Design a protein around this ligand. Structure first.
Ligand SMILES: O=C(O)c1ccc([N+](=O)[O-])cc1C(=O)O
Length: 438
């Protein structure tokens, strides 16, 4: 396969559904490279657990933790890391209210080169145990010879775009990593970077981030087909923000509009949203505790009951993962019969204005609260018009894309409800025999 898109290992599925999955120990293994230094971008960290995931021989190599925590949370993280002398920390600035450092990324510097990992898991045991999570693995990027002058740039501009993302932090520890990236050849990269950084962007910067970045890429590097109006949009996520009092406020006016873009020319496109039902969570491998990682508060939900008619159940027979709750986030554009897709995105971004950006100032400014990162698979970047959808995620012509959940998505039944994490469920017990009492 040319895509290098993986799922994390799930404890409790049959071995056939973990063959070709990756655990964090696999990613950090010496087989992937001889580790010199690493940066771990994330939201939540268990530092004791994280160090144990590195190979023993690599556990004293420098690690930088890039986080967004403030005040007591920030103190707690420093306390976790203090026992480890080789760990430095970078507090990503969050100057807009209610922003989060949500990006999940590893920069792995080897003796042999550099690798970039953009994924969806927090660095805690439970996120890698029984959840559906996504991983993109860069190629091993070789160093550019000292004295040689070449861009090391890819047809997708990934090297410049990654550096731009890191420059947005304005952080001394990340300039080090920028200089490391400058020294390596990333020309083999066949994915496009889609990042979110906090700020208010107008003019030339509008297209740099969030859903305008996606729109810009789809305009420039995808083609519109006949009956494009019949190609649905699919969004799949583990958290929902406040989207407004009806669909015209954000969901179908700027989010959907960015996502239905194809080609340079100038809606009844179906929109499927996939988000675990209460029954999905109750009968999951983890039981109700899985809902601790599906943050949708009752306060927000009751303001937007209109949204839930878009919701479809989590189902992933194709990867044996129907009972492994999703913490991966994906967005894609399938054909009307779901046999092809025009593109696929894996990202940290949930269904949230904070993550994707919201237009301000009479449509001239895109305001983003958070750090997010994902990678976009476009057929043009692989010499293709479209991707065939892989029949079974773990089965076997290598140019079909491994969609990790079932298509078509199944609408909620009349008695289903979206998982809402801060109300009780005491009607029926979960797979461990427990109720949920927030
Ligand atoms: O696990 C995370 O990284 C995470 C952190 C915060 C929020 N949030 O803001 O509600 C959502 C998530 C999520 O990805 O589900």
């Amino acid at each position: 396969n040319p895509f290098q898109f993986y799922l994390t290992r799930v404890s409790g599925v049959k071995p056939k559904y973990n063959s070709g999955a990756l655990h964090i120990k696999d990613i950090l293994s010496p087989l992937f490279g001889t580790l010199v230094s690493s940066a771990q971008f994330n939201y939540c960290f268990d530092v004791d657990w994280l160090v144990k995931q590195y190979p023993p021989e690599f556990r004293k190599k420098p690690i930088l933790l890039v986080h967004g925590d403030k005040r007591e949370a920030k103190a707690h993280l420093h306390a976790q890391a203090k026992p480890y002398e080789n760990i430095s920390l970078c507090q990503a600035k969050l100057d807009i209210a209610f922003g989060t450092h949500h990006t999940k990324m590893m920069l792995l510097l080897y003796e042999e080169g550099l690798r970039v990992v953009i994924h969806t898991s927090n660095l805690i045991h439970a996120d890698w145990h029984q959840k559906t999570q996504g991983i993109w693995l860069s190629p091993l990027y070789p160093r550019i010879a000292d004295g040689t002058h070449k861009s090391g740039e890819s047809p997708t501009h990934f090297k410049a775009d990654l550096i731009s993302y890191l420059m947005a932090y304005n952080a001394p520890s990340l300039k080090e990593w920028i200089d490391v990236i400058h020294k390596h050849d990333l020309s083999e990269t066949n994915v496009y970077l889609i990042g979110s950084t906090p700020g208010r962007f107008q003019g030339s910067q509008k297209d740099n981030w969030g859903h305008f970045r996606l729109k810009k890429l789809l305009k420039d590097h995808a083609s519109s087909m006949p009956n494009a109006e019949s190609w649905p949009v699919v969004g799949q996520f583990s958290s929902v923000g406040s989207l407004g009092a009806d669909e015209s406020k954000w969901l179908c006016s700027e989010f959907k509009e960015s996502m239905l873009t194809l080609g340079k020319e100038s809606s009844s496109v179906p929109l499927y949203l996939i988000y675990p039902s209460v029954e999905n969570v109750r009968t999951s491998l983890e039981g109700y505790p899985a809902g601790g990682s599906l943050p949708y508060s009752i306060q927000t939900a009751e303001k937007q009951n209109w949204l839930h008619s878009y919701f479809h159940k989590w189902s992933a027979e194709t990867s044996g993962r129907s009972n492994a709750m999703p913490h991966i986030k994906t967005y894609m554009r399938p054909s009307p019969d779901f046999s092809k897709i025009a593109w696929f995105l894996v990202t940290s971004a949930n269904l949230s204005k904070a993550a994707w950006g919201a237009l301000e100032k009479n449509g001239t400014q895109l305001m983003i609260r958070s750090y997010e990162l994902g990678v976009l698979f476009l057929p043009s970047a692989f010499g293709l018009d479209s991707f065939k959808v892989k029949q079974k995620f773990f089965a076997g012509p290598m140019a079909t894309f491994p969609v990790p959940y079932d298509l078509p998505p199944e609408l909620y039944g009349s008695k289903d409800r979206p998982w809402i994490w801060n109300i009780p469920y005491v009607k029926a017990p979960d797979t461990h025999g427990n109720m949920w009492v927030p």
